[PDB]
Design a protein around this ligand. Structure first.
Ligand SMILES: CC(C)=CCN1c2cc(C)c(C)cc2N(C[C@H](O)[C@H](O)[C@H](O)COP(=O)(O)O)c2[nH]c(=O)[nH]c(=O)c21
Ligand SMILES: CC(C)=CCN1c2cc(C)c(C)cc2N(C[C@H](O)[C@H](O)[C@H](O)COP(=O)(O)O)c2[nH]c(=O)[nH]c(=O)c21
Ligand SMILES: CC(C)=CCN1c2cc(C)c(C)cc2N(C[C@H](O)[C@H](O)[C@H](O)COP(=O)(O)O)c2[nH]c(=O)[nH]c(=O)c21
Ligand SMILES: CC(C)=CCN1c2cc(C)c(C)cc2N(C[C@H](O)[C@H](O)[C@H](O)COP(=O)(O)O)c2[nH]c(=O)[nH]c(=O)c21
Ligand SMILES: CC(C)=CCN1c2cc(C)c(C)cc2N(C[C@H](O)[C@H](O)[C@H](O)COP(=O)(O)O)c2[nH]c(=O)[nH]c(=O)c21
Ligand SMILES: CC(C)=CCN1c2cc(C)c(C)cc2N(C[C@H](O)[C@H](O)[C@H](O)COP(=O)(O)O)c2[nH]c(=O)[nH]c(=O)c21
Ligand SMILES: CC(C)=CCN1c2cc(C)c(C)cc2N(C[C@H](O)[C@H](O)[C@H](O)COP(=O)(O)O)c2[nH]c(=O)[nH]c(=O)c21
Ligand SMILES: CC(C)=CCN1c2cc(C)c(C)cc2N(C[C@H](O)[C@H](O)[C@H](O)COP(=O)(O)O)c2[nH]c(=O)[nH]c(=O)c21
Ligand code: NA
Ligand code: NA
Ligand code: NA
Ligand code: NA
Ligand code: NA
Ligand code: NA
Ligand code: NA
Ligand code: NA
Lengths: 207, 207, 207, 207, 207, 207, 207, 207
């Protein structure tokens, strides 16, 4: 298998819940183990932007997402926001890649400053210290200098700042096509196969 | 009238030609004068991503866009990439707001470093020196530290970095809705009326 | 009318509750719409430093402040600390000026780092990204280098750092005179008329 | 009326007394109130470079300049270098735009470092703290790194650094034409009408 | 005795002459030796804000302050602004703590840049080089980035930046109470006993 | 002979073609060898601002300038913008001093960032690496922070930033006098004799 | 002759008047022209540390120093602290090397920040902009970070920071030997012959 | 007793062996315990500049210095350059103040960069980490930017940079007087009594 066996997928409270749900679906279909984290604010975004009725508590949420995605038993773990006994909280855990999608400006701030106030922020702190993959998918416009400084600091360390800024070069025909563009870029970053976005120029040879 | 009477609208070679065309259409409908600039690479993006058959040379291009947008004679000026006799090239011109939409990473670089190699880059240099509005709409993912440093430098000076990162909080149903989200944010930044994106919470009063 | 029609007034937990209440009163008397936010810690400061019996929950609080200030129905909105549906949470809202008065060192930190952990901090983040007025009124002494760096970062972006440091050059005779000095400076910053602090030297002509 | 009703015009001891006198004349003709300040060194520059016989003390100086410019009684205030009772010394004064023309390297230094050693330097410090317009017109060549760092710091804060570097693109025929070029740029910066320098390209439409 | 036997107390030309006079009175009552310095501008502030008729020259001033404060002969030294033979001018003097109260923005600048243009600024330069206490009490609002950078530089070196920003948490009933708050904080910084501001929470034990 | 035997004189597209032509004339009269470079944009400035009919191609241009200046055969070399076989392109060439007069903001940018996109920019890069004289004569107003940072970087390395900011202290009577002021300063920087601007104070002895 | 024909020698108010007088004597004996400047504070240092009875005003001072040093008529110019008509005030003057010996911490500050408040500070500003030699001889201990930052900034530009820190490696037997050590180093820096300090190791050949 | 009971005195290879020997003598006379360290290069400086015949190895050296200074048995410890079992090598040792006198540029570098290559450099590293006094007495001229950056870094941390730059304000009559000036300043920094340099201005009272 190419790419990580396990991904920590954190959803935080930026607009674009569709991106995180699509990414979750794609990771499940690629037979990956997902350690799923979601902030309080992200639950309110999901309720506002989608007709996904996500249960609030981790055990109900795990059962719901397992069904929603057609996952295997055990494939989606869900951990609460203060569950320090979960793998992502320690660098002595088995290695995971981590994606924060969507990434609110507040979570971006916390990761850049090392705040570690909940399991998402601690998980990202652990990824950075252990040199494990960390991809942040912010959705905001305009970006202020506060945002940009935080992104720059993290990019300089080795985090991938991948804004939810879909391209139009494969003639998207629906909202789903644009969502799939960004999810494809995340999967490409992680080194996980995807067939939503072709390999640009693969067949080109000269000119 | 609220907002600027004249806007310099530059299209450069990032994916998202739809954004610049929609913005042009909205500015024309708000009875604004538009000084329209387009890079060579942007012409190739437009041909690839749209079925707009934009003529190559400025006089033909002006006539085409005037018809396309239903503009008045004289309302859309078009200037070539080396036309230093055009208003945007000097700070002694009448004041315009300037928008680069889409903004390629190369144009972002040129603006940040002061390269002034064509009329778009000179126009932005003039906006910055004269303290006139400058809005940059980059479309790229991931953003590297090179991109982020360039954006941060310009944001710190007072340019608005407004990534083509549409929100989903008004339940978009088409690609056009997502395009209209970003265009609405640009128009809000410029202080020009728009009725595509409601005023969040305007009717909320308590809780 | 000169100055903003709407002001977001946030009270946080620094000593000087009197300043925020006086400012609220003056804004109401100038027929402005106020979007009123208050932190948990600020409620404890108000109870300690004043004999204002402010109710805890937003609907009761709105009714109380409306009476206290002699405001019109609808003139003072009150929003809770997690109410993301309120206007200040999105830059797509109608434009407001924002004042944090008093501004605790912790709120100053959150604004400088982009933490966005409650509606006050998100509101300030939105003001900065949208280039809308932001005035911070810290009350602390000494100021440490941590405080000063945070203030400097925000001042460099364009926020107004206006310490609760009243002047004595108009011969204050009471605590109220000193409070009114700082409130007058805030109103002057916002461009809202005030007749508490004369225009220095207005009548001077030579020497 | 477009632009500020009141301008603080400070003349300091760089070569180019002609620029400050021309600017004063233009501001008077646009019916603006001018708060006029002049350094000791600037008085020696004026005596060396012009045949203007400027009296030394503020009351005589005010009467002289009023006649010289054809100003109304009261239109030109003159204030001495230690007159802290004058409006420019306090941010509680009515708002003025401020221009230092010419701006010596020593005054540029004082403004950049916050020295406030006389009314000119205090006035500029007040402009910066209150976010009121500040335009500096240095005349020096070469510029050393000391000069450039001081200019950069102030430009980054929002001051306009407008060197006395006239352009030749409207075919100047006399020294007066070159002086009028720089004065026109200052007036354009302030948003005050001027008919000395046309609006570049205003009549251009295509090519 | 706790705290320094000798204090250099410099008054400069910020609003808040009351603070410096109160501090002087408290230091005298604690049987400390005070080396008293005052700027020209501070003499004009004192005349404007108080009904203290301070004589201009050092010998008359010393006699006046000795009476005003009920000091012992010799307890208050007064030194002129160019008296380099006074103790504060050399680091080979006996150690003193130094307080600049109030501290103008111009004196803050001079101390931060090392200007040493009069005995106050030299005295502060000496305190910094000898690692002796230096407390600066600025009174300004807003603080610009120039002010903040100067404060930050000095705080980073070890100076105490203590703005004249009184707290309200001990229910002040008069202007004097607010003055006494700031003076108490200065005395606490210096390690000199004071009974104006209680020790917060001293009697609290749990909760 | 005092000063360099050979000067690389580059004209770029800032306003002030008169300065470069005057400098060329003076260098020829001082019997110096000039390696003459001119940008495309500078040719359009010269055509706009002067009645010099400069041929476009290097061989015609060399013959024209030789006649215009009364130069010796071989004294003025002219090299095209991509002629990497010309001496200025390599640091193994015989040493020349280099002057860019006028220096556009775009050429200033290219030199500061090391862009080397044509022979002028490469020539300046070579001067900096070889520690050979480099004088830049910018003509712009206002200068933005982008401009100022670029100038500061180059000044810190050892380039001379000499803005086209003529002085008035020798009572100029014509445009030519002002042009001659700046050209004299350039020649003084290079250490080449000039008799247009006297040696200030040379005859002064005391007071 | 090796080394500069003319030296601007400025004495400022640091301890070590002996160094400046010795240097003056050596420059006169090497048949150099000296443009002599002295601060008010330096006159008080000279009176305190030496039995040189230096007259206060420039014409008397010039006559006195001419006799004291055995100089030729005209060899020592003396200029007052506000004499802007003296050569050192303009970069269009004939080139001089400049030495500030001793250099007070306040003059070091002024030079580093570009204050130009008197002819000494302006002269140094001119040296830096024109790339002419500038040697600063500070005498202070300890050096604070303020001092060190100012020295570092100037050293980075190309000024020579030469502390009055004599060496003992040629077995000094008197105060005069130690003074002569520092003066020899200054003369070596300037490239002026001196026979007080031998060339270290000149005769050594191997080991 | 005022001041530290124990001082680590390190002599390194700058010119000025006299300073370290005098300081050693004064510390012994004040009944302090001295932990004495000396570099190889310092032994060669001492042999070159003095007629002190210092034995090479630590036990002989200790006996020699004990006699030379009239110290008590045990009062002067001497430790070798690799003796990690000596107290200064660990922060768990009893607290000492540390002085490096003279301080070579190489030892200054090592301390600034944390090199810890011998016991002197380790001892200084320990002083900095434990927040114990560290005084560096460099002797070099000119100081390069390398030197100055190293000094600035250490001063910013809290080390005292005290150059061997004696003052002349107490009319020194011999080399010994100048040596005693610097040693007095060191002792004052350490808080150890000295009667070589009076307390400036102690008896002054007014003017
Ligand atoms: C339309 C509004 C109010 C904003 C657009 N969007 C968003 C949509 C919706 C519908 C809600 C409710 C909230 C947001 N927010 C704000 C955000 O959740 C908060 O700052 C919050 O503190 C984040 O906390 P976490 O980092 O998740 O712990 C948020 N934050 C952000 O960074 N980007 C966004 O797109 C948006
Ligand atoms: C699918 C490819 C190859 C990239 C996506 N997209 C894009 C789409 C298409 C279809 C074309 C052709 C080109 C791009 N580029 C590259 C870009 O135009 C160039 O770097 C170019 O030099 C820009 O020059 P200008 O600044 O306009 O003068 C470009 N640049 C960028 O910054 N963002 C983009 O989205 C893309
Ligand atoms: C006398 C005490 C304990 C401090 C003076 N004052 C204050 C008065 C009172 C009476 C209370 C209770 C609290 C304060 N604080 C502390 C402060 O509220 C907290 O740090 C807190 O976390 C702030 O959270 P928010 O930013 O409001 O969300 C606070 N914080 C601050 O920045 N400035 C202040 O003046 C004071
Ligand atoms: C030909 C000389 C000596 C210089 C050219 N010019 C000038 C002309 C004349 C004829 C005089 C007399 C003085 C100058 N100066 C120097 C200047 O006034 C001083 O540095 C001075 O301290 C400035 O103090 P202020 O900031 O006004 O309080 C000055 N300063 C500057 O920054 N630019 C200039 O053009 C010149
Ligand atoms: C109401 C005015 C004009 C200002 C409020 N206040 C003040 C009050 C009064 C009544 C006077 C007269 C002056 C001030 N100033 C200005 C100040 O004294 C000057 O900048 C001055 O150069 C300072 O020099 P020093 O550092 O003392 O040598 C000053 N400066 C400052 O930093 N803070 C202040 O509060 C005020
Ligand atoms: C009146 C206008 C449009 C501007 C004033 N002036 C100027 C005059 C004329 C009449 C022309 C045509 C052009 C300018 N420019 C713009 C400039 O040439 C361009 O940015 C250009 O890309 C420079 O490229 P190069 O560096 O030479 O390769 C330019 N650039 C600059 O830095 N300073 C100037 O004074 C002006
Ligand atoms: C024993 C005292 C009070 C200090 C030692 N020495 C000195 C000696 C004597 C005997 C006098 C009188 C003055 C000093 N000073 C202080 C100094 O002159 C002042 O800061 C002053 O403002 C300098 O202004 P300038 O830069 O000359 O315009 C001064 N300044 C300095 O930087 N180094 C010194 O060695 C000393
Ligand atoms: C006259 C010479 C060659 C220099 C003056 N002086 C000195 C005098 C004598 C007579 C000797 C032999 C050596 C010096 N040095 C050089 C110095 O010892 C070395 O760089 C050396 O590596 C220092 O190593 P440490 O840090 O002690 O381990 C040295 N280093 C320094 O920083 N300042 C000095 O004054 C001098
Ligand atoms: Na949460
Ligand atoms: Na192009
Ligand atoms: Na709260
Ligand atoms: Na003056
Ligand atoms: Na004074
Ligand atoms: Na070209
Ligand atoms: Na002086
Ligand atoms: Na050694």
């Amino acid at each position: 298998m190419s790419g990580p066996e396990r991904i920590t997928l954190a959803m935080t409270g930026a607009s674009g819940a569709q991106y995180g749900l699509r990414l979750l679906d794609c990771l499940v279909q690629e037979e990956r183990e997902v350690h799923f984290l979601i902030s309080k604010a992200a639950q309110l975004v999901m309720a506002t932007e989608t007709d996904v009725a996500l249960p609030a508590k981790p055990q109900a949420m795990q059962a719901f997402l397992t069904e929603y995605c057609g996952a295997a038993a055990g494939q989606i773990r869900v951990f609460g926001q203060n569950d320090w006994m979960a793998p992502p909280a320690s660098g002595s855990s088995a290695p995971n890649a981590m994606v924060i999608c969507p990434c609110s400006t507040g979570t971006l701030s916390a990761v850049a400053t090392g705040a570690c106030n909940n399991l998402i922020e601690r998980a990202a702190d652990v990824a950075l210290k252990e040199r494990r993959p960390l991809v942040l998918v912010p959705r905001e416009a305009p970006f202020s200098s506060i945002h940009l400084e935080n992104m720059l600091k993290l990019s300089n360390l080795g985090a991938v700042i991948l804004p939810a800024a879909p391209g139009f070069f494969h003639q998207p025909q629906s909202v789903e096509d644009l969502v799939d563009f960004v999810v494809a870029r995340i999967l490409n970053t992680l080194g996980i196969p995807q067939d939503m976005l072709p390999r640009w120029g693969e067949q080109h040879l000269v000119s």
